[PDB]
Amino acid sequence: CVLTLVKDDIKSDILKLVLDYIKVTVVQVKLPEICYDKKITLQYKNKTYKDLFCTLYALIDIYDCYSELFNEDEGKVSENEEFIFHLASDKYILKQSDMKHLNDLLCEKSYIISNKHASIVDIFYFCAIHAVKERIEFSYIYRWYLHIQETLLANFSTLK
Amino acid sequence: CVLTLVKDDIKSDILKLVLDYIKVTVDNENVKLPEICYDKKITLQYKNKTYKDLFCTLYALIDIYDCYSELFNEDEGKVSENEEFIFHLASDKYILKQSDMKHLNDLLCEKSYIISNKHASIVDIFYFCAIHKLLDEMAVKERIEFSYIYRWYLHIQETLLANFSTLK
């Protein structure tokens, strides 16, 4: 139903891209419509979820995408949450070493954690990372980024 | 309704203590807490929906019993702080270094609780479960070396522990 966001929020960017992920990856149904205010919230039915995580797991519940968003197939729920929690705990700021790691990790894997499809981690780090020297030095990251950008960004979303 | 847990898991203990916190902290209404079972994986079957792991079930519980404002100190506007402490902990796989202990002890110096000045927070719960293993074998001289932590732990143990938990 009603998903209130914030105009320039990395967290709101995350939620938008999550909604897009839902649209593109799971819908084959009424998504929420977006409003803007000071603080993220989600009024659904007669319940009111507040803030990002509450809203994230709320949506995840509403739309039954937990096994997808957290890669339950491969039993890598722990890895996913550990990455997104690490990122959010570092206030969504990525050191250049994390940047070079990420490239080393995207060397073999198509995505950051799953070998199959996009994860919640991919979403978080996408929004959190969103010239030429970087594009050639950190080629795997650039590829991954372009791939996510074209495959996932859709109806809501941010800049391209 | 029905909550399934795991026999030797910090995460399971966390959910137990969360239920205890709900019981103690949140007479007019006497609502039905979930019943506890033990399998190989945490779950929570409520109505006809099934929430699958620690954080899904945690936020499920938090929604059902509407204790978010207490657990995250929304009164004091310290939600972010709470989130970042428990997230830092979860990112470190609930592992606490001795380096953490000496600074955590300093953080608990004047303060009754880890983050809140009022009542126990979700942070307090997580760190309670996470240090219980590290403290139920720590010597008295050492246990007193970080005294504020000891006081806090005892506080929590006596105030929160109830029927649901099993920490000794």
Residue type, A115: N
Contact A54 B56 (CB under 8 A): no
Is the CB of residue B108 less than 8 Å from the CB of residue B128?
no
Sheet holding A33-36, edge to edge: A33-36, A2-5, A41-44, A47-50
Sheet holding B49-51, edge to edge: B35-38, B2-5, B43-46, B49-51
How far apart are alpha carbons B143 and B132 in whole angstroms? 12
Q: Which residues pair with A3 in a beta bridge?
A: A34, A42
Name the minimum distance, in Å, from the CA of A75 to any CA of chain B: 12
Q: Which of A80, A85, A91, A125 to mutate to test the interface with B (most CBs of B within 10 A)?
A: A85
Query: Please, what is the angle between helix A52-62 and helix B54-64, to 10°?
Result: 100
**Tokens describing residue B48:** 């006809």
Contact A50 B68 (CB under 8 A): yes
Q: Which residues pair with A41 in a beta bridge?
A: A4, A50
Q: Which of A54, A72, A82 sits opposite B90 (nearest CB)?
A: A82
Asked if residue B130 is part of any domain, the answer here is yes
Asked if residue B105 is part of any domain, the answer here is yes
Contact A89 B93 (CB under 8 A): no
Dihedral sign of CA atoms A106, A108, A113, A116 in order: positive
Contact A85 B79 (CB under 8 A): no
What is the CATH classification number for the domain harbouring B33?
1.20.1050.130
How far apart are alpha carbons A17 and A59 in whole angstroms? 12
Asked if residue A35 is part of any domain, the answer here is yes
Rounded (5°) CA angle B137-B143-B148: 135
Write out the residue range of the structural domain in which residue B59 sits: 2-160
Find how far residue B162's CA is from the centre of its chain.
Answer: 13
Asked if residue B149 is part of any domain, the answer here is yes
Nearest CA-CA partner of B46 in B28, B27, B65: B65
Contact A91 B84 (CB under 8 A): yes
Beta B43-46 vs B49-51: how paired, if at all? antiparallel
Residues of A in contact with B88 (CB under 8 A): 85, 89
Chain B nearest-CA residue for A55:
B59
- Tokens 């803007």 -> residue: A36
A89 contacts chain B (CB < 8 A): yes
Asked if residue B147 is part of any domain, the answer here is yes
Identify the helix (H) or strand (E) that includes residue B46.
strand B43-46
Asked if residue B167 is part of any domain, the answer here is no
How far apart are alpha carbons B79 and A9 in whole angstroms? 16
Beta B43-46 vs B2-5: how paired, if at all? antiparallel
Q: Which residues pair with B35 in a beta bridge?
A: B2
Nearest CA-CA partner of A101 in A88, A86, A89, A91: A86
Asked if residue B168 is part of any domain, the answer here is no
Count CB-CB contacts under 10 A for residue B128.
Answer: 24
The number of domains in chain B is 1
> For residue B90, with 0-12 CB atoms within 10 Å meaning exposed, 13-18 middle and 19 or more buried, which class applies?
buried
Phi, psi (rounded to 5 degrees) for A129: -100, -25
Q: Which residues pair with A4 in a beta bridge?
A: A35, A41
How far apart are alpha carbons B74 and B166 in whole angstroms? 29
Is the CB of residue B154 less than 8 Å from the CB of residue B161?
no
Question: Which parts of chain B fold into alpha helices (H)?
Answer: 10-25, 54-64, 68-71, 79-91, 98-107, 122-135, 140-145, 147-160
Query: Please, what is the angle between helix B79-91 and helix B122-135, to 10°?
Result: 30
**Which experimental method was this entry solved with?**
X-ray
Provide the number of CB pairs (under 8 Å) joining chain A to chain B. 47
Asked if residue A47 is part of any domain, the answer here is yes
Count CB-CB contacts under 10 A for residue A15.
Answer: 24
